[PDB]
């Protein structure tokens, strides 16, 4: 059973102005997924401080990025605190209104797309290189579920039946025909190396087979 949601128009028009604007320095994407995953390893950590029990459903904080150019796919894994239905359907959204209407504006004033993680708006920066993004999460007081969009002004959420995360979150990158680089092992290592260095966090570049 799928749920089809409407995105705010403030973040249906960021999603457009992602994917309409011409803007050639895309690979910042990639660190401001990381980003995202670094502060949701953060998250939990810091819960598991208090409630070690938190980490029963995994206890390794790690990022994975893992490219297939069979299916034309990147795939960033976090094990972090992972996200809810709620923070799916309502609360993130409602968050990043606020920080789209700023970004929105920075940008009339002179800002560039690469400053969009001082908005908390940085997920939607996959759209620079992806036609459709699937996010995989599961929190430990929620139902994994499968988080979908290809922009257009909708996205849907269903229960996840594949295999099971145990806590985290996966943001599954469906690039588009002309970003295959970002599927290259030596494409990716640059760009972490040069925007995420000192990421808290072990990151595996998986190799393709
Ligand atoms: Br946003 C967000 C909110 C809770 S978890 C999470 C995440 C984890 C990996 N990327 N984003």
Do not use: C
Not at 54 to 59: A, F, N, P, R, T
Not at 97 to 124: H, N, P, R, W
Request: negative net charge; charged residues 25%.
């Amino acid at each position: 059973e799928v749920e089809t949601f409407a995105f705010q128009a403030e973040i249906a028009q960021l999603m457009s102005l992602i994917i309409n604007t011409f803007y050639s320095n895309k690979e910042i994407f990639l660190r401001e997924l990381i980003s995202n995953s670094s502060d949701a390893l953060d998250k939990i950590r810091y819960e598991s401080l208090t409630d070690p029990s938190k980490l029963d459903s995994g206890k390794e904080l790690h990022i994975n990025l893992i490219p297939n150019k069979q299916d034309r796919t990147l795939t960033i894994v976090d094990t972090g605190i992972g996200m809810t239905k709620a923070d799916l359907i309502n609360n993130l959204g409602t968050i990043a209104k606020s920080g789209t209407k700023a970004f929105m504006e920075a940008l009339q004033a002179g800002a560039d797309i690469s400053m969009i993680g001082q908005f908390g708006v940085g997920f939607y920066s996959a759209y620079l290189v992806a036609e459709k993004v699937t996010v995989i999460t599961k929190h430990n007081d929620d139902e994994q579920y499968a988080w979908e969009s290809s922009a257009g002004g909708s996205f849907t959420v269903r229960t996840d039946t594949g295999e099971p995360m145990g806590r985290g979150t996966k943001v599954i990158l469906h690039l588009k025909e002309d970003q295959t680089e970002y599927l290259e092992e030596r494409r990716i290592k640059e760009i972490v190396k040069k925007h995420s260095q000192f990421i808290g966090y072990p990151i595996t570049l998986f190799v393709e087979k």
